[PDB]
Amino acid sequence: TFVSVAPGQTARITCGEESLGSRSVIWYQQRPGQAPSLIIYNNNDRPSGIPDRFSGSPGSTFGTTATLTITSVEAGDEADYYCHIWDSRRPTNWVFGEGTTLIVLSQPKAAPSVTLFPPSSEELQANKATLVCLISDFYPGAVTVAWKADSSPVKAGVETTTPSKYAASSYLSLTPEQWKSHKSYSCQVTHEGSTVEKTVAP
Amino acid sequence: CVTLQCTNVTNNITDDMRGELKNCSFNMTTELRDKKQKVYSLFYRYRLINCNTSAITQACPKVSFEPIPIHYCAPAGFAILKCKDKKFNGTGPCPSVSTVQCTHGIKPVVSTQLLLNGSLAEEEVMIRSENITNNAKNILVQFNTPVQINCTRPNNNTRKSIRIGPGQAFYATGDIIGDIRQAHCNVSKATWNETLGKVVKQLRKHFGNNTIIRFANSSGGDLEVTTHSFNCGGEFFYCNTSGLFNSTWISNTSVNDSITLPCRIKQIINMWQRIGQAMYAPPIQGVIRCVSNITGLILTRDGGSTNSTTETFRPGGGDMRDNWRSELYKYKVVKIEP
Amino acid sequence: CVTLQCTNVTNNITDDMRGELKNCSFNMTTELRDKKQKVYSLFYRYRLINCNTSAITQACPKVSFEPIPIHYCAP
Amino acid sequence: QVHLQESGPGLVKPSETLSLTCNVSGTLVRDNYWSWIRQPLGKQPEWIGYVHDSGDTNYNPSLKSRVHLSLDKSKNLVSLRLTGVTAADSAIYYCATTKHGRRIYGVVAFKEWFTYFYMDVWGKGTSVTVSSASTKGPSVFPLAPSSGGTAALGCLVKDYFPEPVTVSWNSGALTSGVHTFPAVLQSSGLYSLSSVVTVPSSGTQTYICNVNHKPSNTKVDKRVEP
Ligand SMILES: *[C@@H]1O[C@H](CO)[C@@H](O[C@@H]2O[C@H](CO)[C@@H](O[C@@H]3O[C@H](CO[C@H]4O[C@H](CO)[C@@H](O)[C@H](O[C@H]5O[C@H](CO)[C@@H](O)[C@H](O)[C@@H]5O[C@H]5O[C@H](CO)[C@@H](O)[C@H](O)[C@@H]5O)[C@@H]4O)[C@@H](O)[C@H](O[C@H]4O[C@H](CO)[C@@H](O)[C@H](O)[C@@H]4O[C@H]4O[C@H](CO)[C@@H](O)[C@H](O)[C@@H]4O[C@H]4O[C@H](CO)[C@@H](O)[C@H](O)[C@@H]4O)[C@@H]3O)[C@H](O)[C@H]2NC(C)=O)[C@H](O)[C@H]1NC(C)=O
Ligand SMILES: *[C@@H]1O[C@H](CO)[C@@H](O[C@@H]2O[C@H](CO)[C@@H](O[C@@H]3O[C@H](CO[C@H]4O[C@H](CO[C@H]5O[C@H](CO)[C@@H](O)[C@H](O)[C@@H]5O)[C@@H](O)[C@H](O[C@H]5O[C@H](CO)[C@@H](O)[C@H](O)[C@@H]5O)[C@@H]4O)[C@@H](O)[C@H](O[C@H]4O[C@H](CO)[C@@H](O)[C@H](O)[C@@H]4O)[C@@H]3O)[C@H](O)[C@H]2NC(C)=O)[C@H](O)[C@H]1NC(C)=O
Ligand SMILES: *[C@@H]1O[C@H](CO)[C@@H](O[C@@H]2O[C@H](CO)[C@@H](O[C@@H]3O[C@H](CO[C@H]4O[C@H](CO[C@H]5O[C@H](CO)[C@@H](O)[C@H](O)[C@@H]5O)[C@@H](O)[C@H](O[C@H]5O[C@H](CO)[C@@H](O)[C@H](O)[C@@H]5O)[C@@H]4O)[C@@H](O)[C@H](O[C@H]4O[C@H](CO)[C@@H](O)[C@H](O)[C@@H]4O)[C@@H]3O)[C@H](O)[C@H]2NC(C)=O)[C@H](O)[C@H]1NC(C)=O
Ligand SMILES: *[C@@H]1O[C@H](CO)[C@@H](O[C@@H]2O[C@H](CO)[C@@H](O[C@@H]3O[C@H](CO[C@H]4O[C@H](CO[C@H]5O[C@H](CO)[C@@H](O)[C@H](O)[C@@H]5O)[C@@H](O)[C@H](O[C@H]5O[C@H](CO)[C@@H](O)[C@H](O)[C@@H]5O)[C@@H]4O)[C@@H](O)[C@H](O[C@H]4O[C@H](CO)[C@@H](O)[C@H](O)[C@@H]4O)[C@@H]3O)[C@H](O)[C@H]2NC(C)=O)[C@H](O)[C@H]1NC(C)=O
Ligand SMILES: *[C@@H]1O[C@H](CO)[C@@H](O[C@@H]2O[C@H](CO)[C@@H](O[C@@H]3O[C@H](CO[C@H]4O[C@H](CO[C@H]5O[C@H](CO)[C@@H](O)[C@H](O)[C@@H]5O)[C@@H](O)[C@H](O[C@H]5O[C@H](CO)[C@@H](O)[C@H](O)[C@@H]5O)[C@@H]4O)[C@@H](O)[C@H](O[C@H]4O[C@H](CO)[C@@H](O)[C@H](O)[C@@H]4O)[C@@H]3O)[C@H](O)[C@H]2NC(C)=O)[C@H](O)[C@H]1NC(C)=O
Ligand SMILES: *[C@@H]1O[C@H](CO)[C@@H](O[C@@H]2O[C@H](CO)[C@@H](O[C@@H]3O[C@H](CO[C@H]4O[C@H](CO[C@H]5O[C@H](CO)[C@@H](O)[C@H](O)[C@@H]5O)[C@@H](O)[C@H](O[C@H]5O[C@H](CO)[C@@H](O)[C@H](O)[C@@H]5O)[C@@H]4O)[C@@H](O)[C@H](O[C@H]4O[C@H](CO)[C@@H](O)[C@H](O)[C@@H]4O)[C@@H]3O)[C@H](O)[C@H]2NC(C)=O)[C@H](O)[C@H]1NC(C)=O
Ligand SMILES: *[C@@H]1O[C@H](CO)[C@@H](O)[C@H](O)[C@H]1NC(C)=O
Ligand SMILES: *[C@@H]1O[C@H](CO)[C@@H](O)[C@H](O)[C@H]1NC(C)=O
Ligand SMILES: *[C@@H]1O[C@H](CO)[C@@H](O)[C@H](O)[C@H]1NC(C)=O
Ligand SMILES: *[C@@H]1O[C@H](CO)[C@@H](O)[C@H](O)[C@H]1NC(C)=O
Ligand SMILES: *[C@@H]1O[C@H](CO)[C@@H](O)[C@H](O)[C@H]1NC(C)=O
Ligand SMILES: *[C@@H]1O[C@H](CO)[C@@H](O)[C@H](O)[C@H]1NC(C)=O
Ligand SMILES: *[C@@H]1O[C@H](CO)[C@@H](O)[C@H](O)[C@H]1NC(C)=O
Ligand SMILES: *[C@@H]1O[C@H](CO)[C@@H](O)[C@H](O)[C@H]1NC(C)=O
Fold it and tell me: Where is this region: V5 (chain B) (predicted)?
């Protein structure tokens, strides 16, 4: 899942099933492009190099979920976080709990440039068609992209990049007759509360 | 009680534990004619299995079960003689007879092997037997001092009494969790050290002149006979009793850690004769510890030889009347005439 | 007392009377094992409804209920 | 410093055996528990198993019949083999050092005692893709300019395998206005990417994209015209 927080504030992340028996929960921190790295063991113990901003919820009250709390959050804390649960009434867990992405909202307000290209004549001559939606110069790096055929949502053929250092791309694969059939197709980019749309037609 | 659709909470396993306690699913007449609803049921001891040919279920909205002091008095024109002699041979010479109208108040403690609560000896430890030669006769060993026994059963059950129908009154136990180990207990040993030493002392100053005394566990039988079957408030506890009887006492001379005993809670007990089984159906709450004073021993002797150069003693009991003789030992109702 | 298959004698209506008394149809264990017969039933107060968690039915062949003078004396 | 470095083939065909090595420095392998862990793209980590020279060793039950873990004391390394691989086994694989802890209560709570493991040192990881492609060359198409006085302009690099592809403009004499997007891995298991430039709309300079795909020895120069 996702958890967003402002710098200096407190983040909380929930992971794993509700407790049944006595618990030892392990927490790991994994930065983008890096190997997983740890955070906590034995519910609230920290290894060398980990500050006391990071704390884990006791392996305690039955029927509750393990939580990792990070106080005074900084941008360096932005990462994926995973738990590994040891519960006296459950089998060894060989899969870590589902991860949570921590977003630290440090900066506002850059708006994306969008450009929308129709299929090229050459591609059409190759009996293929691709709509190309280029998205750039935006921050933060969260957008969602949707495509429309006339007014109808596209259910297939859409491939969209995760943005990086932001820029992102979306491609709609169509047949030439699909392309020629409809009045228009639209690329809709959703960014920071607003949605920018561009349209293209034969 | 017909058939039970039970399952187990074990998703990985060692020691082939199975379970004494099971949380189960059922089909239950609620209201009207022939409707059912899915209902939780717990059985203390997979499908079927039921009960054997009788089941009374106690439960009830307002009840409990803790022994209450009951005094026994003599009527009009009657007295009760009372031997206040500290050293009584049980069949025998008693110098001080008194006459009370009413007893001090006796508590109805239902247990085997040990007396819990009960009364202590005024002077020293006193051993008592109806026939010291006959090994089939019980030996009520009364203590001048209590050996501790703290019993914590931290098993948890949440009370749900569904009143769905007029004639029907159903409970629902087996909610929540906590993974309690069975039901647990302890006996505290320092007392048990001195007391057992002194007991083999009394034994060797009575019938046992020169003999090494050994204590093996229960010889076998019904769960009420093999374990120290007692109650912590209406549930029937059964305790592995090897921890109490596993010491060989050397005739030559005498010879912080506490003894921890494994116990089990039962709902289905067999009262009376076989007229019916009795169930305390909704054990309410959880984490219930009963601290008790070990006031006793009921023993039966293992008939041995004299070539063994040792005497073996085993826990016996069963007829609670023996427990009352162990309590009603200083009362005999008598009547007066001119 | 399980469920009652009741109807009303109102074929035209004012004041939304419904009824305190209802003449109803039922399914009743008569003799043997699991046979029924259609039976009249009245309820003083549509389907179901029954009774709430107890019903003793007095009836009886020879009874009635009129207060009878009872004297209280000292021993 | 304790330091682990994983190595492997990078690419494995379906049904083949994956063989990975974890080179260890700063400690001796006999003196640690070692755990292999795997983590697929976009997913949470999935462990693999732990091994110790003592024989105190255990494998993820779901992988039980296919996995083998070993320690090599002479070379100071830890090894993994995984047989009969499929696309489901594609992931980043990590070698780690696994520490053991116990939750211990009063004897009244003996049934609730248990041991737990935590992975305290990780390698950088080795990427394992189980796919079936020997090679595939890209198809390159121009993205024609059409429309601030400025227009965008590009090249589409479609359906190649594996990564990477390099794209330049005018042999390198155009690096500004240039944006080469990261490739998308399609459901076909092929990659595609695009590169764009922003130029003044006014018929001077010529615009050519140069695409090179080294794994397939493919180089294509594509002129992009209105
Ligand atoms: C039947 O007979 C048998 C023997 O034959 C007896 O068996 C005993 O059973 C009891 C009941 O459970 C046992 O008690 C548990 O013991 C656990 C292990 O304790 C050992 O290791 C601990 C270190 O963790 C050590 O401290 C203990 O020694 C201490 O006590 C002795 C005296 O007994 C003393 O001499 C020492 O100096 C120690 O005292 C220190 O520590 C104390 C706290 O433990 C302080 O109060 C004291 O000031 C001093 O600092 C012993 O060597 C132990 O972990 C368990 O404690 C748990 O659970 C308890 C509830 O069951 C709860 O009351 C405690 O607070 C504690 O819970 C906290 O910690 C656990 C994990 O430790 C967490 O999961 C909880 O969430 C909670 O966390 C809080 O504390 C954390 C740590 O401080 C902290 O991180 C967190 O933030 C929270 O604040 C039990 O106490 C006993 O061990 C068994 N005996 C034997 C021989 O094995 C049995 O008694 C007998 N039955 C009867 C009826 O008599
Ligand atoms: C004792 O042992 C027995 C087993 O032998 C076990 O019995 C359980 O009893 C409890 C209580 O009766 C049951 O819990 C309930 O389950 C209800 C059904 O949940 C199932 O289906 C869910 C969706 O069902 C909807 O749609 C389906 C069709 O798809 C339809 O049939 C249903 O009627 C309903 O419309 C499904 O979500 C659920 O699976 C969830 O949980 C599992 C993990 O357990 C997870 O893997 C899934 O991903 C998913 O998250 C399951 O398959 C459920 O509706 C009900 O929930 C409502 O009520 C509770 C409160 O009671 C609320 O908290 C909740 O918000 C809802 O309002 C409830 O959870 C359980 O199903 C029985 N288990 C079995 C095997 O039958 C007891 O657990 C044991 N007791 C102890 C002490 O251990
Ligand atoms: C076995 O099962 C049994 C049940 O059969 C179960 O019994 C529990 O026993 C424990 C310990 O006694 C109880 O824990 C306590 O619960 C107290 C009551 O909590 C309830 O009400 C809370 C608010 O109550 C206030 O206001 C109400 C009126 O609104 C008033 O009646 C109260 O008197 C009080 O003024 C409420 O917040 C709470 O719900 C919380 O938690 C649930 C999840 O459990 C969650 O869903 C809610 O959103 C909410 O977060 C609940 O409804 C509670 O006051 C008390 O907390 C104080 O003490 C603890 C320390 O003991 C402190 O940590 C805490 O900060 C408070 O100071 C405490 O938590 C529990 O209520 C019993 N459960 C039941 C069903 O009765 C055992 O747990 C089980 N045992 C084992 C071994 O597993
Ligand atoms: C054999 O000898 C042993 C002793 O060796 C003795 O063992 C007793 O066993 C019985 C039955 O199980 C116990 O009776 C129960 O006692 C419960 C606990 O009572 C104590 O604590 C009361 C309050 O406790 C609450 O809060 C505390 C924290 O403060 C918490 O720990 C508890 O869990 C609970 O939440 C306290 O009020 C009480 O003291 C009262 O009584 C004394 C006199 O006895 C008086 O001096 C005080 O002023 C006060 O009035 C005590 O300290 C208790 O909760 C429980 O009561 C509930 O259930 C009963 C029905 O069983 C209801 O009638 C009642 O309304 C409640 O719902 C119950 O009374 C007893 O505690 C054990 N005693 C000891 C010392 O362990 C046996 O009595 C002996 N057996 C024989 C043959 O008699
Ligand atoms: C079974 O079905 C039958 C039909 O088959 C049906 O019969 C009804 O029986 C009831 C009870 O007898 C009748 O109810 C009464 O109706 C009276 C007449 O109302 C009509 O005229 C109203 C004005 O009349 C006044 O002025 C005229 C001159 O214009 C004068 O001669 C009259 O004497 C009188 O002074 C008129 O307002 C009314 O229409 C109103 O209601 C309709 C909706 O129903 C609405 O559309 C209109 O806009 C308007 O609001 C109607 O046209 C009426 O006077 C009388 O009301 C008085 O008494 C009641 C108490 O009984 C008070 O509550 C009220 O305040 C007045 O004091 C009463 O309502 C009804 O007329 C019969 N219907 C027909 C079609 O004839 C039964 O309902 C069914 N049930 C049973 C078991 O019989
Ligand atoms: C749920 O599933 C989990 C798995 O997911 C499973 O986990 C098991 O948990 C149990 C309990 O912890 C483990 O049992 C113990 O295993 C110990 C290790 O045994 C292995 O190594 C043995 C030799 O080791 C000795 O020598 C080495 C040097 O080489 C030294 O380092 C060691 O420390 C030790 O001194 C070896 O003999 C053994 O293999 C034997 O058994 C297999 C069949 O199982 C057979 O094929 C072999 O030929 C051989 O006979 C194994 O490889 C072991 O030492 C330990 O035994 C001692 O304690 C027990 C009491 O606990 C005594 O009974 C016994 O006499 C010894 O004193 C114990 O058996 C087990 O290892 C886990 N399984 C795995 C795979 O890790 C659980 O079973 C499931 N249940 C739960 C709830 O967890
Ligand atoms: C109740 O349901 C179970 C299946 O869940 C079935 O086996 C059993 O026969 C049913 N009992 C009744 C009353 O029909
Ligand atoms: C008790 O009485 C019996 C005979 O009835 C005797 O054998 C035994 O020695 C007596 N004990 C004492 C203390 O005299
Ligand atoms: C007691 O039992 C023994 C046999 O065990 C017997 O010899 C003796 O006569 C018995 N005493 C009495 C009073 O019956
Ligand atoms: C239980 O508590 C009593 C005091 O209340 C103590 O004397 C006894 O030693 C305890 N039992 C054990 C086994 O520790
Ligand atoms: C407890 O007693 C039984 C017999 O009643 C015996 O078989 C068992 O070994 C004993 N358990 C322990 C822990 O000694
Ligand atoms: C009793 O203790 C002895 C050692 O003194 C041990 O060999 C034996 O196994 C124990 N018996 C039981 C049943 O606990
Ligand atoms: C058990 O005995 C001791 C003193 O011998 C006392 O402190 C404790 O209260 C006793 N328990 C009971 C039931 O009175
Ligand atoms: C009796 O018949 C009615 C329909 O007339 C039906 O709704 C009801 O279920 C029946 N009752 C029984 C006993 O089957």
Answer: 306-316
Supply the range of the domain harboring residue A124: 105-202
- Which of B11, B176, B179 shows the shortest C-beta gap to A88? B179
Which amino acid is it at B83?
Answer: C
Is the CB of residue B131 below 6 angstroms from any atom belonging to ligand 9? Answer: yes
Give me the sheet containing C41-44, strands edge to edge: C5-7, C21-25, C41-44
Q: How many domains does chain A have?
A: 2
Q: D60-69: which pairs have CB atoms within 8 A and are 24 or more residues apart?
A: D60/A94, D61/A94, D62/A94, D69/D34, D69/D36
Residue of A nearest to D49 (CA): A94
Which chain B positions have a beta carbon within 8 Å of D61's beta carbon? none
Q: Are D63 and D37 in contact (CB under 8 A)?
A: no
Which amino acid is residue A135, in one-letter code?
I
Interface touch A21/B176, C-beta < 8 Å: no
D154 has which bridge partners?
Answer: D143, D196
> From CA A149, how far away is CA B56, in angstroms rounded?
72
Q: Ligand 10 atom 3: the closest Cα is on which residue?
A: B148
Neighbours of C19 (CB within 10 A): 15
Q: Are A106 and A127 in contact (CB under 8 A)?
A: no
In this structure, the answer to whether residues A116 and A144 fall within a common structural domain is yes
With a CB cutoff of 8 Å and minimum separation 6, the contacts of B14 are none
CATH number of D1-132: 2.60.40.10
C-alpha C55/C-alpha B164 separation (Å) is: 14
CATH number of the CATH domain containing A139: 2.60.40.10
Same domain? For A121 and A199 the reply is yes
Tokens found for residue D175: 């690096």
Write D213-218 long-range contacts (CB < 8 A, 24+).
D213/D137, D213/D138, D213/D160, D213/D165, D214/D164, D214/D166, D215/D135, D215/D161, D215/D162, D216/D135, D216/D136, D216/D137, D216/D138, D216/D160, D218/D137, D218/D138, D218/D160
Residue A97 and residue A83 in contact, taking contact as beta carbons nearer than 8 Å:
yes
Question: With an 8 Å Cβ cutoff, is B50 touching chain D?
Answer: no
Q: Does B11 touch chain A (CB under 8 A)?
A: yes
**Dist CA B38 CA D155 (whole Å):** 65
- Give me the residue spans of the domains in chain D: 1-132, 133-226
Tell me which of A77, A104, A131 is where a domain ends: A104
Separation between Cα atoms, residue A185 and residue A25, nearest integer Å:
50
| Rounded-to-integer distance, Cα A106 and Cα B42, Å | 55
- The CATH architecture one would assign to domain D133-226 is Sandwich (2.60)
Q: Do B179 and D108 touch (CB under 8 A)?
A: no
Using CA atoms, how far apart are residues B140 and B128, in angstroms rounded to an integer? Answer: 5
Domain identity same for A1 and A99: yes
B105 alpha carbon – ligand 13 mean position (Å):
17
Mark whether A115 and A156 lie in a shared domain: yes
Give the angle subtended at the CA of B309 by the CAs of B307 and B312, to the nearest 5°. Answer: 110
Q: Are D1-132 and D133-226 the same fold in CATH? A: yes
Instruction: Please indicate, yes or no, whether residues A166 and A84 belong to a single structural domain of this protein.
Output: no
Is the CB of C1 less than 8 angstroms away from the CB of B165? no
Instruction: Tell whether A193 is within 8 A of chain B (Cβ).
Output: no
Is C2 within 8 Å of chain B by CB? yes
Residue B329 Cα to ligand 8 midpoint, Å, equals: 18
Domain end, chosen from A58, A77, A104, is at: A104
